[PDB]
Amino acid sequence: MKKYVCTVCGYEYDPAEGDPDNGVKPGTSFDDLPADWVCPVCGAPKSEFEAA
Ligand SMILES: [Fe+3]
Numbered sequence: 001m002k003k004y005v006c007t008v009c010g011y012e013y014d015p016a017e018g019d020p021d022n023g024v025k026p027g028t029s030f031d032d033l034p035a036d037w038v039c040p041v042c043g044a045p046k047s048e049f050e051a052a
Contacts, residue, residue, distance in 0.1 A: 004030045005052035008044035012052055 004013045013019070013033070018026040019040055024033060030049070038045055 002030065003052045004049040006039040006042060006044050007048050007050055009039060009042040011039050011041040013049065 001015045003015070005011070006013075013030050015029050016026060018024040018028045019033075019037070020026075022034075022037060022040060024037065030046075033046065039049070
């Protein structure tokens with residue numbers, strides 16, 4: 001349940017919540033996000049998130 005933060009905009013990916021609108025059910029770890037998933041608030045890539 002390790003949270004990751006977007007270093008572009010500050011959105012925090014929370015595995016307990018997932019990201020339903022992008023096809024990511026609650027409980028999905030950051031490491032298991034789809035290869036094309038991007039920050040839902042700003043569009044930044046996963047390579048620009050850091051552990052938070
Ligand atoms: Fe972002």
